Design a protein around this ligand. Structure first.
Ligand SMILES: O=P(O)(O)/C=C/CCSc1ccccc1O
Ligand SMILES: O=P(O)(O)/C=C/CCSc1ccccc1O
Ligand SMILES: *Cc1c(COP(=O)(O)O)cnc(C)c1O
Ligand SMILES: *Cc1c(COP(=O)(O)O)cnc(C)c1O
Ligand code: NA
Ligand code: NA
Lengths: 264, 387, 387, 264
């Protein structure tokens, strides 16, 4: 119950969660493991980790290039799970969530995918291209292996959607702050959804999409959200420093520390 | 949803949550339009007086000489634009309009779907945005200029393999934040529901016309109807009206490229693996890791990395049979139709003709009433075959 | 002869004595075929089920916006082969066959008449021989390969200016010693009798169909019908059925090239001089010495050095009016139809559309029911306009 | 009555006529005048002279190239008549026949063309692309100016054609020995036409097309024809010797002398 304890701990501290995102193996297996440890060391409360996919159709240019860079290093899904096993052996308590595209979980059988997640220590799985209308098999397999099935609550969500997300989801509710794809390029009033999700005893909301400044995470928390996820702002730093790994890490720490502080 | 998103095990609605309301809207506007006589009369008018409907059914006499086979050809090559794709887009453009939408987004590979989307949008006052993998933009210059000349915005997609796959991605990305004012004009009978159902229903004319036509010309339904399958549109459009006629065989022909055995092909329904991509559960050109792969064929238009869900379903229950045809086989059918019938067939269609020629040549004494869907014109392919 | 070789002062039968028996034979086989229901039913069958007859009549709404003009377009671009030329050749090929002939000789400039002759001959088992001025063979590569792919023998003519003029010469030279087994499939409504009469009668469908069609759609004959005039075939095919309807104006549009004033044009009927050549007495692109000259136009298909005798006659009595249109004017009409109607028109046809646009734009408050003959498709011209 | 006296003279000699053909101005005005005088000096009984035309559609490759060579030297119709005026001032008795294409006679008015022929001394005019069915204006204008209108009697000629040719024609009847165009390339039984033309009191027949060997002219005469016309065999010699004008003339004489001898 990694997310459960994390949120209870953060609540007692009257604090929000800061959850950075990166593509596993970007720009290399080793630099990525190093990037991930720096992320945690600078104050990350949890992690959202994507495994490289050929067609990331819910991602903008930054994350697209994150998958391309990973692909260029030859990072395969098998390698990702090996990386995840090690990250867990290194960090016992931090919630580990995976950003997944559908073919990758269905490829070797949906059930076998969630069993691998368990074996490795993954805490949750968000399948980016499976709406709640199609979640049944994924949801069921996740629960069967003690994996929290993450659902996306969009800004155009109706009440039936809110009620579905709140009953099926575990770990955290992914609250979109915008329409469109991932990108720190376009900046995202979510109070109503936040209150309604609370009413239905949904999983603590985590705002995602567009979150690039500490100001943004303080506002998410102020609006009632349990925390915020930031990906492109994070990955942009990796892109910015491909020729200087040491500066990458140094810059990664600076942003994450400034971002974590904004939730306190 | 109002209709079943699946055909057996295949289909579904695998798109990010943000796009679900758009698919529900689209589905409902389709069901309404389908029952709307004003829409039907408007679509019928565009089809007849602007596109050239109905198309001819040509008895190829010379080609079948010395055999007991009778071969007709659905002349979709005579439609405005040179391909069956024109039927689909007109209806979808009217659908976009019914919805209050005035913006169109379109994915294209060989450039045939883009040209079609572009002409439909020009005609109906819609703003057209078209995505094309950079490698296809460099490869398909004449179609790009045609598109641009018809008012459409052409946008090169450099991500991934910079081809169809990637163009499709970009279109859904765009749509995920523009659905409120723009409609996504998908190019084939694949993708997320309601699309496979809509493209089919909007391609039905083909088989509906072939029925009355053959019934008039031969007083009998065909023994089989053959059509190429890149994505599945022209084939299902032909098949559709014959599905309940159990005596008529349905034959889908997938591109074999250099040979199945070489791995250099575009035959996912038969030599691919079921996966989930492009808002769909269906057979796919995939790696062992489930990374999406490319479809190869001498014909650019038969390079959609997957196939329609209904086809994968018709194959599953045995209603329809799917075979493949190599580059050389298509080259030969192409050559033969030019020489004996005076018709230059698209290299896409040539795969379908190639199979009919096989059926004939292999069993020359067998009495057979065959209809091949000549989905498009081959003026496009003159240079390619030449080299 | 059975029919009058002349239209007023124009026409005649100016061929060497050796070919007179061939023209008399041809004339008589035409008159017989015309009264033969079996021939008529055979020509009608080829036209309908093989070529795509009848063609649509498309109301161009967007293009005429903001004016009191209603414009329709005869969709000859949707015929098999992409041009009206296909009607003519099918009938002439059946004529050759009626005559016991099994060899076809054909002259071509832009390659459109050659492609047409080639497909007709392939379809009907005739041996096709095509002559093309060397300069046109080098210039028209895609049409040459198409022709060759359809079984036709392509033969470059290097004599003279190595263009249409010279190709026509070679064909008559060939015919002067092969007429006994081969028929000369002339490409337009010009040349020696009975050709102008035959091509017309075999192009009549166009105007005959436009009548019933406009009568159904508007319950009135058009105020005028407009068509480009390179040689005269597509124009007379349109005009023909409207000649006795004195209220309908007939408008022939000749290519103006860079401007009449520059001498770089293809407008002989209006800016040429009457002469005797190609088995005909008619207006001609000629020097002051009576040496035959070339016709210039951005469109290759409008480069026949003369014009049909009937047109020169309809102009003489005032039945029809002939104007001209420059390269830029045709470029603009071409551009506009692509953008507002989604139709890529041949640069030949564009000259006709350009005049209709002028009539409109110049008198926007004038109520006008106009029909422009869109004799062909413009996919051909994409590169040319592009450069 | 140039042809009239020539044929009466040749009849008394029990001799046939040899009539060579060349394009005026081929390969140059001066060389052509020189070629023509050599033709006569070697024994030509008459001349068939063509004026350069842009589209000689009744001529094969040899004569086609004859027109091209003339064109390259800038030989205009006006220049041709000037050449003809001089040839006549040089030779008073030899019959001069012109090979003409229709546009060239109609260009400046059909009537004005035949008046120019008279003024210059031309004896006849054969308009290659005007059948008897269309000869009326040309025939009428020719006679009006004492020019013999020449008609072509083809091998496929019917009786009505034979009867027309015999009544309208003057000077000589052009008897084709073949179908096709001019050319020494393809060699051409004309006895029936020859006897029938004689019966209708036609003009003395002159066989043309394919005549390239002395054997051929002796046979024409033996069959009853009054003589033979040879063009391509003649022009081929000009083509063969463009780089050696002196050899051209020398060779021209040799062939014409050998050809003339064959009619005696
Ligand atoms: O780059 P951002 O800060 O706009 C968003 C990052 C979240 C990455 S997780 C995620 C969530 C939904 C669909 C695709 C994804 O990759
Ligand atoms: O080259 P030949 O010997 O076969 C014939 C020569 C005669 C020239 S006169 C002539 C006669 C009729 C039509 C065209 C002509 O140029
Ligand atoms: C567009 C295209 C195709 C690919 O077709 P689907 O019907 O969508 O499989 C096939 N044939 C032609 C001529 C095409 O242009
Ligand atoms: C062949 C051609 C012409 C020239 O036409 P005539 O009708 O013979 O004057 C005109 N338009 C098109 C499209 C052609 O292809
Ligand atoms: Na496919
Ligand atoms: Na002309």
């Amino acid at each position: 119950e990694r997310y459960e304890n994390l949120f209870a701990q953060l609540n007692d501290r009257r604090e929000g969660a800061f959850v950075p995102f990166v593509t596993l193996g970007d720009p290399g297996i080793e630099q990525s493991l190093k990037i991930i440890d720096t992320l945690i060391d600078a104050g990350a409360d949890a992690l959202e980790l994507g495994v490289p996919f050929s067609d990331p159709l819910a991602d903008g240019p930054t994350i697209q290039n994150a998958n391309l860079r990973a692909f260029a290093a030859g990072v395969t899904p098998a390698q990702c799970f090996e990386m995840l096993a090690l990250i867990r052996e290194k960090h016992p308590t931090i919630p580990i969530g995976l950003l997944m595209y559908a073919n990758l979980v269905f490829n070797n059988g949906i059930d076998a995918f969630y069993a691998r997640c368990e074996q490795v220590g993954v805490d949750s799985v968000l399948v980016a291209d499976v709406p709640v209308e199609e979640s049944a098999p994924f949801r069921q397999a996740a629960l069967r292996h003690n994996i929290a099935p993450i659902f996306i609550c969009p800004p155009n969500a109706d009440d039936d959607l809110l009620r579905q997300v709140a009953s099926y989801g575990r770990g955290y509710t992914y609250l979109l702050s915008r329409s469109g794809v991932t990108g720190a390029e376009n900046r995202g009033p979510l109070h109503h959804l936040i209150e309604k999700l609370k009413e239905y005893h949904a999983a603590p909301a985590l705002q995602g999409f567009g979150i690039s400044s500490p100001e943004q995470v303080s506002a998410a928390v102020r609006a009632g959200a349990a925390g915020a996820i930031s990906g492109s702002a994070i990955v942009k730093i990796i892109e910015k420093n491909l020729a200087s790994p040491k500066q990458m890490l140094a810059e990664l720490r600076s942003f994450v520390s400034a971002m974590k502080a904004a939730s306190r | 949803t109002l209709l079943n998103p699946y055909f057996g095990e295949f289909g579904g609605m695998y798109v990010p949550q943000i796009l679900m309301p758009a698919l529900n809207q689209l589905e409902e506007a389709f069901v309404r339009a389908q029952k709307d006589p004003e829409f039907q009369a408007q679509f019928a008018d565009l089809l007849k007086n602007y596109a050239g409907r109905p198309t001819a059914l040509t008895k190829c006499q010379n080609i079948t000489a010395g055999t007991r086979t009778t071969l007709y050809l659905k002349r979709e090559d005579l439609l405005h634009g040179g391909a069956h794709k024109t039927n689909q887009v007109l209806g979808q453009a009217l659908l976009a309009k019914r919805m209050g939408k005035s913006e169109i987004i379109a994915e294209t590979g060989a450039g045939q779907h883009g040209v079609a989307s572009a002409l439909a949008s020009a005609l109906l006052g819609l703003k057209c945005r078209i995505y094309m993998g950079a490698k296809d933009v460099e490869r398909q210059s004449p179609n790009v200029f045609r598109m641009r000349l018809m008012g459409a915005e052409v946008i090169p997609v450099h991500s991934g393999s910079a081809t169809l796959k990637d163009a499709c991605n970009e279109a859904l990305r765009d749509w995920s934040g523009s659905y409120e004012t723009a409609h996504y004009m998908l190019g084939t009978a694949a993708g997320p529901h309601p699309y496979p159902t809509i493209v089919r229903e909007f391609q039905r004319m083909i088989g509906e016309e072939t029925k009355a036509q053959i019934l008039d010309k031969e007083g009998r339904l065909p023994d089989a109807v053959i059509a190429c399958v890149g994505g599945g549109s022209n084939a299902i459009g032909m098949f559709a009206d014959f599905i309940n006629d159990t005596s008529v065989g349905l034959i889908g022909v997938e591109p074999g490229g250099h040979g199945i055995e070489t791995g250099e092909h575009g035959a996912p329904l038969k030599h691919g693996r079921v996966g989930i991509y492009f808002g769909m559960k269906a057979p796919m050109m995939q790696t062992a890791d489930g990374q999406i792969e490319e479809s190869y064929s001498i014909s650019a238009g038969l390079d959609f990395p997957s196939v329609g869900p209904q086809h994968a379903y018709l194959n599953s229950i045995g209603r329809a049979d799917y075979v493949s045809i190599t580059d050389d086989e298509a080259l030969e059918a192409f050559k033969t139709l030019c020489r004996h019938e005076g018709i230059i067939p698209a290299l896409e269609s040539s795969h379908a003709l190639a199979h009919a020629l096989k059926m004939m040549r292999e069993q020359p004494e067998k009495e057979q009433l065959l209809v091949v869907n000549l989905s498009g014109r081959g003026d496009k392919d003159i240079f390619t075959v030449h080299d």
